[PDB]
Each structure stands twice: as C-alpha cells, then as structure tokens.
C-alpha cells in the first residue's frame, strides 16, 4: 500500500569538509503518491574509481531507483563517468551543478542521463542572439575535437542559414588537443583568421592553451572579441587570467537559485516521474541497485520511465528535457569577464527570448573614419555656380563653398541639395571644389580626363554633378543608383534615318551636340556617320548651343534629357519643346562616382532612395526642375 521510493544524492566539494548534510529532502509537495526515502553521502575530490566504487557501494542491496550528482568541480569528464554507470545500471542519474551540468558526448539512447546545463544547440543559439544584438554580423569558429563538435557546427549552420541578414562565416577550425604540439600548429592556423568575432569551443583546460597561444598570436586584442559556451566558464569560481578580458560567455546563475534549491528540483523530477509512471501503470519503480551482478529483471522495462521523465513540471516550473538529456530551456545568464577577475553578469535569457542590459560600445570616430573631398562642375541648369556677395565675404543660405584652381565660387543647386541631404543622413563631412581639366570626364587616346581623373588620382573620393552613366565609367568606378529619369534627347521649334543621313534630304539638315560628352562618345561608338557629320555642328556651350537653335542657323539641338526638359519648361518664350513625349532612347539617370569595390558604397544607395522614400524629391523637382512652359499641357 504505502509506496516509498528509494533515492540517493551526493555533493562533492562545497568548499567544506562537513559539507552541508541533508539540508533538503524535507517533505514538500507530500501529496505526490510516492514519498521519497533519501540517503545522502558526500565525497571530497573526484575520481573514476572513487565515484564508481561509492555509487555501487550505495547500491548494495539498498536498491536505489535514482541518483542526483553535484560537484564543486570544474571538471568536464565527470558527467560521462556517471553516465557510463547509468548505461550499466539503467538507473536514472542527473546532475545539478558544475561538471555534470557541463556538456558531454551524445548520450546512448538506451542509457539514461540528464544534465541541468543547457543544450549545446541552445547555447549556440544564445551566442547567435548575442552577436545579433550587437549586430556583429561577421564571425569565425575555433573548435576542438571534444564531443559536440559538428553538433555545434551543424547547429550554427542551421541557425545561420535561416536568417535574412548577410552574415559571414569566415573559418571553421578543428584541432586535436591530442597529438599535442611542438609545431604550435594551433598558432599557425589561428594566425590566419582575420575575423572580428570568434566563437570558441573546447574543454575547460584546452581554452587556457588556446588562449595563451592566441595571446602570442595577438588575437585577444583591440577590436576582436571572443564568445564562449558553458564549458569554458564552468563553475566561474576559478578563472586563470590566461583568458583574455572582455571574454563573453553564457552560464547558469548561482544567485537566482542556490544549489540546494536545484537539488530540490532534481528530487522533485525523480519523484514526479515516479508519480506519473505510477499513475500510468500503478507500478513501483523500485529496482535492485547492485551493479556487480546482472541488471535486475524488469529493469529492462525501465525504458518507459525515460519516456515519462523527459518533460516534468513542479512549482510552476518546467524541467522539460531534450532527447540528448539536457533540459529544454533552463534560465540562462549572459556573463562577461569584468576587468580584473570578476565574472559580472551582462544579460538574462529565457525560453524563446533574450534580454541584455548595456546599450552601446560594450566593453577618431568609433563608428567610422576618414574625410572625403568632392569635385563637381557647373550645369547650365543644375549645379549652379554663383558669385558670392563681396560685402558678405562668404556664402549665403543654401549655397555651399566650392573652390576652383586657376578664387572661391559658391555652388548651389540639385547636386548641392541631394549631396546635403545625403551628408545629413550618413553623417559625414566633405570638401567641395570645382574641376579644371575637361569638366565631365573625357578620353583623348589612352587617358581619361575630368572629375573622373580626380576620382582615379584619388584627389576626389566621389564625383557629383549632372554626370551621365555609361559602361566604361561603371567599369572603372562604382556608381550610385539613378535619382532622375534622363538621357539623350532632342529639343526643337515647331530612328527614321533622317538623322542617319542629311544628304538624303536635298536641303541640308542640321543637328549638333556638345563635344567631350557622354552623348558624343556614345554616338561615336554606335553611329559613326552621325558623329563625323555633326562635328561641324558642335557648339561651345549649352547657352551658345541654344544661341544656334534660338536665333536660327540651326534646326535641331541634342542634349541630356533632364536639361532639355527643364529648358523646355524654362524659356523666355515657349519657342522651344521636346521631341515626341520626350521619351528618350539610351534611358539613363544621373549617378555618382566612388573609387572601386571598396567604398561606403551601399550605405550611399540606401540614403538615396530614402530621399524619394519620404517624397522630398517631388518637392525638389517642383522647386528646381519644374519649368513654367509646357503650360498648355
């Protein structure tokens, strides 16, 4: 009738001879159908022989049906040993602290062993959450042959593949601690990796050697940071300073719940599993404990117990395990090595979600560096140079200074405003000047000219203006996305091959464009006859080209579409208009120069479409681009 179970628990260490005996086991939750019978024993230092002998010794005829192990020790190995006994006995064993809690090789399925440490997979997940929180995207992994490797590599792989972010795995390293090195082979590899954020995985002892070697390699310093699983930190009571400071790692907290509370959790799990198994089969779990002889009969039946024991709940708290035998989601704390020897908590993490305390710059501008000088040119419609009021002595309002080597000129306009907003958003400061040789870039024989030259000579980082886009310049320098719809176009008063030959039409026809332009170069590339014919009709400047159109002596003019459209809108009389719908061939937009694959690059691009994203460009279009003509619409 009265179903009293038989249980045993052990504490090692506790920094005391006369370690606190039988603090717990006091009746709690007595309602549970089986009452616990407890025998407590302690042993001072761990050994395979001492532990094996003692646990079997307690087994005797005693017939205990469960065991909880706890330690003051930092030792990795212990868990496996007790697990081995479990494999032999089929008697459940679990552990609440230290090494037993420390991770171990994948448990034999038949075997029953449990740990109150977190799952390897779970820990890797937390490491990832930590990196994501500080937005450290790029990282590498240093590992050792110790068990759980490739369960870890796989877990990281799974966790990483799913996320949207463009994180980079740089290197994965597997080094055998066995075949210990004269070669400093670990030094020879570790020296290779350039990545800022490093995940390390190994035994507590191994971390020391890897770290001394890293200290030789120079990997512990200045901008690189290391992140660690439970095992290395272990107890956290003892910390060789061979570990670098700023080392980041997760562990279970002593403060939240003390060790006896944890032991209470273990006992509760064992007796709850006993109660549930009872409820299911009304059967006593009690079994003969003696290891030396063959395992007791009907102990083979015990498998279901494991099946029952995996998830257990008491005190409104879930003990649920995972197939490996780690608890599914124990509460966990993000810890850092405070300066000196301190292990001081940084974060709390539970279940699905994680929370961390410090805001910024955890543990000459930190975000970014250097300065950028910019070159431009004055557009007859866009980029406007104005002469500053001499009495004032310096630029006014929207006008931003630009210098031309030959005198301070004051630039304002579309490029100035777009640049200004961009500078405001990305938050950098810049120097603006004017180009001298060749304006927009021009090729004579082998060599480039213009702002592009100053971009190539590194006398300019980025070139801004009415500059059009083409394959050659995109080849030499990265370009910003087009902000405006533009291109080649025609402007006249009011593919047919009428352009292709003038001579087909008996009266001489006339059309021309500005030389050294992207338009003229494109023309020469695709259509030769047009270029060779139009060289006579080429004009000095857009105002003068306009003089050729306006006063007569020229029929048609060809130029950039944005300028021709703005000029369409703005004219002293509506004497000038675009061609057709002004729908332009060679559909292009104004870009912006950068050096090469290395540049702020994408950061710029985002800024640009944010400008349209808030609808500013429409306003700026109405103010700067909009002309009065095209009034009859």
């Amino acid at each position: 009738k009265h179903p009293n179970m038989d249980i045993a628990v052990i504490l090692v260490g506790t920094t005391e001879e006369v370690a606190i005996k039988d603090v717990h086991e006091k009746d709690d939750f007595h309602h549970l159908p089986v009452t616990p019978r407890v025998e407590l024993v302690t042993m001072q230092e761990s050994d395979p022989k001492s532990i094996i002998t003692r646990i079997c010794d307690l087994m005797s005829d005693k017939k205990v049906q469960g065991v909880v192990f706890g330690d003051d020790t930092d030792q990795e190995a212990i868990a496996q040993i007790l697990d081995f006994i479990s494999v032999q006995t089929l008697t459940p064993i679990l552990g609440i602290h230290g090494g037993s809690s420390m991770i171990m090789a994948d448990k034999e399925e038949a075997s029953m062993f449990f740990q109150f440490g977190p799952s390897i997979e779970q820990q890797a997940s937390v490491m990832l959450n930590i990196m994501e929180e500080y937005d450290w995207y790029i990282f590498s992994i240093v590992t050792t042959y110790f068990p759980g490797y490739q369960d870890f590599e796989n877990k990281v792989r799974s966790t990483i593949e799913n996320s949207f972010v463009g994180w980079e795995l740089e290197e994965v390293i597997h080094l055998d601690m066995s075949l210990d090195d004269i070669d400093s082979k670990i030094q020879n590899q570790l020296k290779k990796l350039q990545s800022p954020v490093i995940l390390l995985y190994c035994t507590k002892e191994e971390a020391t050697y890897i770290f001394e070697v890293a200290h030789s390699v120079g990997l512990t310093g200045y901008g690189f940071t290391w992140i660690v699983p439970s095992l290395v930190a272990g107890d956290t009571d003892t910390v060789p300073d061979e570990f670098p400071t700023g080392l980041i790692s997760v562990s279970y907290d002593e403060w939240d719940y003390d060790l006896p509370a944890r032991v209470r959790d273990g006992i509760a799990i064992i007796t709850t599993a006993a109660s549930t198994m009872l409820s299911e089969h009304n059967s006593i779990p009690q079994s003969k404990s003696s290891c030396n002889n063959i395992q007791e009969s009907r102990v083979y039946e015990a498998h279901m117990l494991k099946r029952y024991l995996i998830n257990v709940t008491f005190e409104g708290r879930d003990l649920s395990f995972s197939e490996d035998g780690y608890q599914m989601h124990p509460k966990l704390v993000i810890i850092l090595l405070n300066q000196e020897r301190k292990w001081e908590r940084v974060g709390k993490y539970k279940d699905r979600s994680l929370k961390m305390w410090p805001v910024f710059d955890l543990y000459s501008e930190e975000h970014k560096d250097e300065h950028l000088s910019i070159v431009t040119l004055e557009e007859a419609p866009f980029v406007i140079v104005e002469d500053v009021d001499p009495l004032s002595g310096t630029c006014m309002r929207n006008t931003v200074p630009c210098r031309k080597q030959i005198i301070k000129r004051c630039c304002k306009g579309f490029c100035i405003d777009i640049l200004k907003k961009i500078a405001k958003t990305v938050k950098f400061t810049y120097d603006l000047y004017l180009v001298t040789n060749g304006k927009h870039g021009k090729k004579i024989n082998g060599v480039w000219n213009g702002m592009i030259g100053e971009v190539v000579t590194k006398r300019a980082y980025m070139a801004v203006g009415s500059l059009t886009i083409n394959e050659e310049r995109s080849e030499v320098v990265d370009f910003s996305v087009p902000f405006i719809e533009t291109g080649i176009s025609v402007m006249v008063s009011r593919s047919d091959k009428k352009f292709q030959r003038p001579n087909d039409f008996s009266p001489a026809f006339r059309f021309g464009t500005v030389p050294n332009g992207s338009t003229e170069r494109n023309i020469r590339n695709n259509y030769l006859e047009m270029h060779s014919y139009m060289v006579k009709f080429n004009q000095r400047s857009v105002q003068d080209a306009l003089l050729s159109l306006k006063s007569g002596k020229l029929d048609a003019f060809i130029y950039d579409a944005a300028v021709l459209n703005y000029m369409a809108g703005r004219d002293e009389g509506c004497k000038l208009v675009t061609i057709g719908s002004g729908k332009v061939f060679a559909t292009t937009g104004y870009g912006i120069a950068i050096q090469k694959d290395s540049g702020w690059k994408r950061q710029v691009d985002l800024a640009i479409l944010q400008l349209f994203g808030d609808g500013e460009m429409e306003e700026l279009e109405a103010l700067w681009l909009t002309g009065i003509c095209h009034n009859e619409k």
């Binding site: 050994d47 001492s50 094996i52 079997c56 030792q75 110790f146 799974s158 799913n162 719908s581 559909t587």
Partner: protein
C-alpha cells in the same frame, strides 16, 4: 640506475599474459637496460565492464602504466567489450592499444582520444573495394549498410574515397539492425541500374540479408557481391550465396603476434620518448588524481609516428585516427559452398592468387556490371494539354490540322476537380511531348511522365533547417529527384542556372503584353511608368517574371505595382483580359502568341524583352543532358522545331489590327 617503466594489459588468458611478459622481456633485453627497463602487468577479462574499469584504476594504474593493451574476450559480450578502457585510460590520456578490436566506433578521436590499434577497422576494408572497383572498372555499384556508427562510417569512408573521383553515390541503402525481413528495400535496389552490390552488416543481419536477397534472386549472375569479414563468417556463412567476394584480415584471430609487435612498437616509442625531456610519470593510482597526464598525448604522438616497419604482423604505420595503415587482407571466394583464397591483398595493391575467379552463378570468368526517366511538367496551354483518359480507355485519335493523328501520353498530376486534391491519372499531349518521344526514338531512354503537384514551375521560398524546403514546384522535384528530368516550357535564367544544368533552348522567346485590340508603347511603357489603380497591369506571383522583378534592382520600384492584383494561373490571367477584368496582361511570348492567334480579340504588343529561351532541366551531375543539347541542336538544323511550331501554332485567324 635502472628505472622500471610499467606497461599494462587486459588479455584473454593467463597463457597470453605469459606471452605478453615474454615479449616485454624481449624488448628489455634488446634495448638499453642501463638507462631504462620495461615491466609488464596484465589481467584477464572481467565479466562486466565495471569490474574491469575498477581493475584498470586499481590493479593497473596503481602500477603507473605508461600504456595499456586490450584484446577481445573469449566469448564476445554485445560488442566493443573493450569500450570501457578507452574511456578509463582516456581520462588520464593514457594511450590504449587494442589487438582484436576491429570495431569502427573507436575511429572517432573525439569520443576515444587515446585509442590506437594494430588492426584497421571494418570501415577501412573499403580501401580494398575501391581498389577492387578500380581494377574491374565498375564505377556503378550499390551499397547496403546497417544503420549504426559502423555502417555509416563504412559509407563515409567509401564515399570519401569516391570524392577524389567524381563523387559516386550510384545508390546507397540503409536498413536498421535486427530486422528479419528486408524485402522491400531490395525491391527498390533492383530498379537501380547498377548491378554490383557491396554490403556491411552483422552476422545475424547478414543472414537476413542473404535470406531476403535469395528470394528476389539477386544472388544470380550479372550481379556481384562484395562484403566484410563479418558477413562471410558465422551463421551468415551458412545462408551465404555462391560466387560472393569476401574479405578476411590477416592475423585477426591471433592476439599474440599483435602482442609481440605492439609491445615492440611500445618499446620503440618509449625509447624514442625518453630522448625527450620534461617527461612526467603517469599518475600513481586512480585515487586522489583529478588531473590528466601531460605526457600522454605526446606518447600518443610519437607512438602514432613510430615506424619500425619490420614486424611479425606486417608493415606498421598509423593513420590520423590512430587506426592502423597498410594492413593486409586475404580475399575469399565461396566456390562449391566453401571458402577459398582467390587472391590476397597486401599494401595498397591487390595480389592475385593462382586460383580461378568465381562470380555468382556459373562463370568461368564473368566480370559483368551496370533505365527509366521520371518526367515532370506544368499545365501550360500551348506546349502541354490535359484531358483525362476516357474511363479506362486511353487517348483520343484526334488529328492535327495537317492530317496527322495526335500523339499522347499518360501523366499523373494535380486535379482541382475533386474538392480535395488527389494526384490524378490523366492524359497529356504536347509539343514538348512530341519532342520528348522524338528524343526517345533518338535516345536509348524510356519515359514515364507525371505533372508536378504544384501548379508553379518553381520559386525559392520558406525558411530553412535540417530538412530544407527549397524552391516550390517541379524544379524542386528535379533537385529532390521526384523527376530526374523536366520537360516543360521553362525560361532559362542564371539564378536557377547555378543549381542545375540546362539544355540548349528548343525555343527563343521574350516577355510581352496582351491587351484587347478592339476599339503599350514599349517594354518600358510610360503607361506602366504612369501606373494607375484605374489601369491594371496583371501577372502571376511566383511566375519567373516575378523573379525578374525581385532580382533586378534597376526596375525594383516597378515590381510592386505589378505585384498588386496577381493571378494564380495562366488561364485565369488570359481570362481577366478576355473578361476585361484587367486591362493588360504580362507574360512570355511563347505561351502568349499562340493565344493571340487563338482569339484575335486580344493582341500582343511591343518588342519581346527579357529575351530568353525555353529548355529542358537536368542536374549538372547527369551526363544525359550532354546528349540532350546535342540532340536539341540536331533537331534545330533539320527544321523539326520549325514544323512543330508550325503545327502547334495555328496562325489561322488574326492580323495587325490598326
């Protein structure tokens, strides 16, 4: 002064202990006794693991052993009965050397990091098979493994051998141990073309394997069997098929030869070791020492590199895992239901004994070794048509406009007719089908076609984890292998292209727009550029066009307007314009122009943009595609395609309306 350096061992019998001590004394006598001396300690196997582990900690380690030797017990209990020692010594990093454990699970340094052996594991036997496979030139085989660290390790090793070559997974077959009936799996095996088989399993499992295999007559000629030492032995030998090829490791049974040699190696290793300084004795006794032994890994390092090629057992060198290298096996044949040595294998090269080769069934010499294409499609009106087979009766005699009977084939595909969606037997006839059969007459292959469950051809989606999802649709079936080859109207693009090989285009076409004639300037239409809620422009989400919209940055803004009011399938998309629900429709021409002819109420406009081609999908690994393109071109030159488009594009009634 002399220093007594202990060694320890666990062996089968006291006689073998005496053999051990004798070998040790031979080591002492033949190397300097003035500087150092070796001492021997040993114990018989104990009934459980625990008595033995206790023996190591008490009886052996109290003697300060620098290393331990272990052998399999007289009656094997379960398997890997020398499991505990590798763990027990391992705590202190004391090197362990097994004599009789051919078990593979000790090869992983991670779990057993102190473990070395004078014999190669069963996995390493694959070295022979690759060499065997090498000689006979069969690249195509089948592998049957039990499911455990043993079988999976064998698979990994052989596959790793194959990795240097183009990776060859002709097929692989996993079964789980203790299963008396394996019939279904072999039924799956026969379908695979490759006629050569290799297997690894336990004796009891092997009985079941041969028992099941004989039922399906896979033991017959034209089939070859390659196997592990365990398979030929025991009860498995009794039920074993004739002509099988088999392996036996040399001196595998003998502990003693391996004893003399192992101890010889240990001696050489130690004498080489003490040449080094900063040495420490192993921990005295298990009790009171929680710490490892710093020397132990070094002792392992020298011992793994320890040469001494001359030995009673054969050449000695150790692989990275501590497993032995360059071991010798003796190949065995089943002739007249008895074991015979056809040849013997030593070193990296096989050796052929004078005995005649036997193959299964009757062969004086018979080295013989080594079809069905699963095809998938989608419902696209011009190149594919779907009608169910009338009752049981198959296909209609319906005739093309040019007098020819229409060809047809059976296809299993999604049906929306039933409220639930069953994969339904159907009749499908098409341009792509005529092409496929044209190939089938040209090509050695035979074809069975079923339409993909998803109406979509394919697009990347979902999340990710162990069982990655992958792009939904027929393409996904291709990577999955549900269909080995894809015949459909598929546009060819780089994003897909990296994943799979693409056949040369049968057709050349580009995207365009359908709008009703009866009262869009360009691919770039200001009207598109000037979108309107009032003027719709419609497409199919997950259609490749959508991939063009998402992947391309330059038009990336324009994508979203199209995204609104998307249709699920082609018929509905054409219908909307026909129903006048949607003013415009955007799709690739090859599907669209045929419809343009079909109604003429609707028209195509502008210039094909996103100019592309349609091609037949295959995995890069499959060489048949090499012929396919080669065939496709051959079909282009003669004008076969021109006449097929001429047949299936009617062109009957329509014109430029204006």
């Amino acid at each position: 002064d002399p220093k007594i350096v202990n060694i320890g061992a666990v062996l089968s019998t006291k006689k073998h202990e005496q053999i051990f001590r004798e070998a040790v004394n031979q080591a002492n006598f033949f190397h300097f006794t003035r500087k150092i001396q070796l001492n021997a300690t040993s114990v018989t196997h104990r009934p459980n693991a625990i008595q033995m582990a206790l023996s190591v900690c008490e009886d052996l380690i109290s003697s300060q052993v620098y290393a331990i030797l272990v052998s399999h017990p007289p009656a094997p209990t379960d398997h890997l009965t020398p499991t505990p020692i590798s763990y027990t010594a391992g705590f202190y990093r004391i090197p362990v050397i097994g004599l009789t454990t051919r078990m593979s699970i000790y090869s992983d340094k991670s779990i057993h990091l102190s473990f070395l052996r004078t014999v190669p594991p069963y996995s390493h036997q694959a070295l022979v098979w690759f060499e065997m496979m090498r000689l006979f030139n069969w690249n195509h085989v089948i592998l049957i493994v039990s499911d455990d660290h043993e079988g999976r390790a064998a698979q990994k090793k052989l596959e790793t051998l194959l990795e240097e070559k183009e990776s060859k997974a002709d097929k692989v077959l996993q079964f789980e141990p203790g299963t008396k009936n394996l019939t279904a799996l072999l039924l799956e095996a026969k379908e695979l073309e490759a006629r050569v088989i290799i297997l690894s399993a336990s004796e009891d499992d092997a009985t079941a394997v041969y028992k099941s295999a004989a039922m399906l007559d896979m033991t017959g000629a034209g089939y070859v069997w390659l196997v592990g030492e365990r398979e030929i032995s025991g009860s498995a030998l009794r039920y074993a098929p004739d002509g099988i090829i088999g392996l036996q490791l040399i001196n595998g049974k003998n502990e003693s030869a391996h004893i003399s040699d192992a101890v010889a190696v240990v001696a050489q290793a130690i004498h080489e070791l003490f040449e080094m300084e900063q040495i420490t004795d192993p921990p005295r006794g298990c009790v009171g020492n929680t710490n490892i032994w710093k020397t132990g890994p070094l002792f392992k390092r020298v011992l793994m590199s320890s040469k001494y090629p001359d030995g009673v057992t054969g050449r000695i060198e150790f692989n990275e895992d501590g497993d032995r290298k360059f071991a010798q096996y003796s190949i065995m044949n089943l002739q007249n239901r008895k074991l015979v040595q056809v040849g013997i294998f030593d070193g990296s090269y096989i050796i052929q004994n004078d005995r005649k080769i036997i193959w299964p069934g009757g062969e004086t010499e018979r080295p013989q070794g080594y079809t069905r294409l699963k095809i998938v499609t989608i419902h696209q009106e011009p190149f594919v048509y779907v009608r169910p087979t009338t009752s049981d009766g198959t296909c209609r005699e319906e005739y093309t406009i040019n007098g020819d009977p229409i060809k047809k084939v059976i296809c299993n595909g999604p049906d929306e007719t039933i409220p639930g969606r069953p994969t339904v037997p159907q009749c499908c006839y098409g341009f792509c089908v005529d092409l496929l059969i044209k190939l089938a007459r040209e090509m050695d292959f035979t074809y069975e076609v079923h339409l993909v469950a998803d109406g979509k051809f394919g697009t990347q989606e979902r999340v990710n984890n162990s069982n990655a999802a992958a792009w939904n649709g027929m393409m996904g079936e291709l990577l999955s292998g549900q269909a080995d080859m894809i015949v459909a109207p598929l546009t060819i693009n780089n994003e897909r292209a990296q994943y799979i090989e693409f056949s040369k285009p049968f057709k050349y076409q580009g995207l365009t727009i359908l709008v009703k004639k009866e009262i869009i300037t360009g691919i770039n239409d200001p009207r598109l550029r000037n979108p309107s809620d009032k003027f719709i422009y419609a497409t199919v989400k997950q259609s490749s066009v959508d991939i063009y919209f998402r992947r391309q940055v330059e038009l990336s803004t324009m994508y979203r307007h199209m995204e609104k009011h998307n249709y699920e399938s082609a018929a509905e998309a054409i219908q909307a314009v026909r129903d006048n629900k949607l003013h415009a429709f955007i799709w690739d021409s090859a599907v669209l122009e045929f419809e343009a002819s079909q109604k003429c109420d609707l028209v195509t406009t502008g210039e094909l943009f996103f100019r592309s081609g349609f091609g037949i999908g295959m995995r890069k690994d499959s060489p048949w595609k090499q012929e396919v393109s080669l065939n496709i071109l051959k079909s282009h030159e003669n004008g076969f395609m021109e006449e097929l488009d001429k047949t299936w594009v009617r062109y009957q009634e329509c014109d430029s309306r204006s």
